[PDB]
Ligand binder design. Sequence first.
Ligand SMILES: Nc1c(Cl)cncc1Cl
Ligand SMILES: Nc1c(Cl)cncc1Cl
Ligand SMILES: [Cl-]
Ligand code: NA
Lengths: 306, 305
Amino acid sequence: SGFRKMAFPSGKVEGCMVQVTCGTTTLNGLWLDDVVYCPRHVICTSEDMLNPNYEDLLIRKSNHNFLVQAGNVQLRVIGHSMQNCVLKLKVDTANPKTPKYKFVRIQPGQTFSVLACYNGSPSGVYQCAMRPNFTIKGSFLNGSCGSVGFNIDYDCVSFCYMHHMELPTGVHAGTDLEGNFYGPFVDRQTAQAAGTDTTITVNVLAWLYAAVINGDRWFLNRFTTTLNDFNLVAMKYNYEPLTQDHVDILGPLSAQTGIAVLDMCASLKELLQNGMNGRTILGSALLEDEFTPFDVVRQCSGVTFQ
Amino acid sequence: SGFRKMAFPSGKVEGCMVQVTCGTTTLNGLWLDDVVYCPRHVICTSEDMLNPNYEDLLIRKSNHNFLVQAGNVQLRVIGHSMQNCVLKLKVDTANPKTPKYKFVRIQPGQTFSVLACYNGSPSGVYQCAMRPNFTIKGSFLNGSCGSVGFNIDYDCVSFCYMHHMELPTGVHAGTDLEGNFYGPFVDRQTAQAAGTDTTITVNVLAWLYAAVINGDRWFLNRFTTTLNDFNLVAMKYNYEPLTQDHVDILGPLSAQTGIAVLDMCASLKELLQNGMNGRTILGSALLEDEFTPFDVVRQCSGVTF
Ligand SMILES: Nc1c(Cl)cncc1Cl
Ligand SMILES: Nc1c(Cl)cncc1Cl
Ligand SMILES: [Cl-]
Ligand code: NA
């Protein structure tokens, strides 16, 4: 029993974190095989924040302008290239702790673990979700750029996020490991702002299913809803639309608990209307939306506490 | 910016987890130097657990009755003994991934990271506090016994918890690595219950400081109070007493933010007496008590390992 924000064990990623220095800037890089990946803005100076021309900045750099430190060891850079907003530094040594890995670009609502690092050394690990507005609500200080987000499945690390910047509202923006930003953001210091965010409806439903599996039913009701009526209500609370894809994805949790998806939609509708009236769900007084259907199945018992 | 429930990086502990099997029971062990540590209840059948005599059950077992698997490799057990409620299996090979470590017993209110494991395979990491009632609000399924909790200081892993059981309310109980239980619990299938829990006041104050540092200031007010007056409010609301040591520990946060502890105690008193009035603090509608003062300082400073 229990239900926690649970991250993946971070050791496989810890073995890949290095420190990249260019001029006076130091940030983190990810060392896989003989390549170190890091945000391309490591090459910007004070004058390159608003309108950097990364091609012109990079052509002026030689391999030995990049200092890469893995633990106490200097790595020698023997090549460099830019791919979208990530810099790929070829180094003379393959990382002997390279795990089985892949690069995956995720969709809004997906979760992943973040290994926050500073000067190439990891500080902590926590769970994040890609918000509908393509930001993440992380915990990042200066020096954390190049920290990565990931999932682990059967000893294979799927890298899905690299940290690039903090927006004015205190939320965070970054790229996949191919250097393509999530959302409309760019690696420039011009005024940009996250769109209005919304609640991840399919995840809230997943977490309500988690609560039932762990033995709590107080929020259910005798009602159902059509999918369209549910969506008409939920968008009045700034909830994301629920699609037939989402209904299908919730099938397994519905079968395990015996609660039809649209019946749990009816429970959510009433929860938005009523609040919790001094009660909690899985220890929270708010509706939680950073557990996916897959997250719930991976953490919860396959046997409902009836 | 940002404030998240954050665990220590778990790599140093992952390299120590092994699978321990005795008869039909598989659970997790901690492999350090040439010893594997696991719950002594690994040797019990279901019937044994109704009333186990552990020394008696252990005599019947021989070294080859303990199957220990590190990843894909078997470890040969060459000795076995008990220390309190943990079994110590001496093996032929020292763990080459043994970190610098110590065994430490923590105090209620202190936090630690839990590496949840099944069949010797780490599955997840999360942050826990030792509750005042000596339980932890963990997330564990069957097969999780022997999963461990820890803190890291520089390069040194301080192991503080080994998982042994789940109580009927779904919270969890275990031992330190010397096998001493946290709380009034025993490793046998008998009637046991979590006692009434309380809220960890110094941690709530720490988290309020975290909120101020992150720009969440609506609950600040012009008032202050005294330790004696506040502790009357704390006891009324089932909060732990605040001591002068707690005030001293929060000293740095009071200096950094300009809210003295008794100044912040006045904010907390008002939150206890009136509620949150529809507002949230660091995205919570509840007052969070599983961040210590050091947790807040570490995460708002960027200390690494
Ligand atoms: N200054 C930063 C950077 Cl560069 C990245 N993440 C967070 C902050 Cl506050
Ligand atoms: N059955 C258990 C055990 Cl033995 C330990 N932790 C949690 C659970 Cl649900
Ligand atoms: Cl006053
Ligand atoms: Na005050």
